Amino acid sequence: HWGYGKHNGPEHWHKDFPIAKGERQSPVDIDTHTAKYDPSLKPLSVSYDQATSLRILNNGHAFNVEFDDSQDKAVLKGGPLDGTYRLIQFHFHWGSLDGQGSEHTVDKKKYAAELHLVHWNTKYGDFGKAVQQPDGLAVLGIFLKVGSAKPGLQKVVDVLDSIKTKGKSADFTNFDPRGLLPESLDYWTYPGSLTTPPLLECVTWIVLKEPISVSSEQVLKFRKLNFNGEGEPEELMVDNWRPAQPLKNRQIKASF
Ligand SMILES: COC[C@H](NC(C)=O)C(=O)NCc1ccccc1
Ligand SMILES: [Hg+2]
Ligand SMILES: [Hg+2]
Ligand SMILES: [Zn+2]
């Protein structure tokens, strides 16, 4: 089954998921000199004050912080988006070393990690129908660099002990994702896909320019996580990132 290793990694995904060679695949390199400032972009609106987190799951490829999306609380609108997209989960992609980890790159620069807060277009009723639509999803991408600790990430850090192997989950209520946002909402945007199989080409990507700083000790604990399930030999959850894919004539816009 799909993973990030030699025998099942991103170079193999196309066999089960043909769309891997598709026309709007993600992530991509953000060539900052070719992206164009777009005057028609409305200001971004990230409203996470009412967010209702439920749990945290090791799914054998990343961990998911999942939210109650049965009502219009944590919502993303504005920017390149039409209408409202509700927050369903977030997860990270991260490296084995600080020089790699992010999925999107900026002028070929890799960050230590990347956070994706995943949202679905509420005109489609739920997530399931949302991923059958070219505008079904909006993902806010945020870079991580190793630096000063990020106070609003330590509560996820602290819980990782409890979900070390594939298929474990713990309760994770009252988590405030506002604690993960850099100061500036300047971003690049382009149409793309999810970066894990099934790689569905349903995503409006909104990639923040300003990275968050996280401490080495915080990112170390990410890398103590396991891809294997309990009582299987240890494979560290590291390098769970897909590399940049062909742009194929899509245009990246800057909000700034
Ligand atoms: C990770 O592939 C699934 C898909 N991924 C996204 C949205 O980033 C998703 O909607 N996941 C959320 C979810 C998971 C299990 C049950 C119900 C909802
Ligand atoms: Hg998985
Ligand atoms: Hg789609
Ligand atoms: Zn992701």
**C-alpha 134 – ligand 3 centre gap (Å):** 4
Query: Which residues have C-beta within 8 Å of that of residue 79, sequence separation ≥ 6?
Result: 41, 42, 43, 44, 45, 187, 189, 206, 255
Pairing relationship of beta strands 53-58 and 42-47 according to DSSP bridges: unpaired
- Residue 90's Cα: distance from chain center in Å? 6
204 beta partners: 138, 191
Which atom belonging to ligand 1 lies closest to the Cα atom of 198? 2
Judge if the upstream peptide bond of residue 198 is cis by omega within 30 degrees of 0. yes
| The token pair that represents 160 in the structure block | 């990782």
The CA radius of gyration of the chain, in Å to the nearest whole number, is: 17
CATH of the domain at 240: 3.10.200.10
| Cα angle: 64, vertex 101, 184; to 5 degrees | 80
Count structural domains, the chain. Answer: 1
Query: Which residues have C-beta within 8 Å of that of residue 74, sequence separation ≥ 6?
Result: 47, 48, 50, 51, 52, 67, 86, 87, 177
Query: Which residues have C-beta within 8 Å of that of residue 236, sequence separation ≥ 6?
Result: 96, 223, 224, 225, 226, 227
Judge if the upstream peptide bond of residue 27 is cis by omega within 30 degrees of 0. yes
Q: Give me the phi and psi of 144, to 5 degrees please.
A: -110, 135
Which amino acid, residue 115?
Answer: L
Q: Give me the phi and psi of 182, to 5 degrees please.
A: -70, -175
Range of the domain at 200: 1-256
Pocket residues for ligand 1 (CB within 6 Å)? 88-89, 118, 127, 194
Q: Which ligand is nearest to the CA of 57?
A: 1
| Cα angle: 136, vertex 89, 245; to 5 degrees | 60
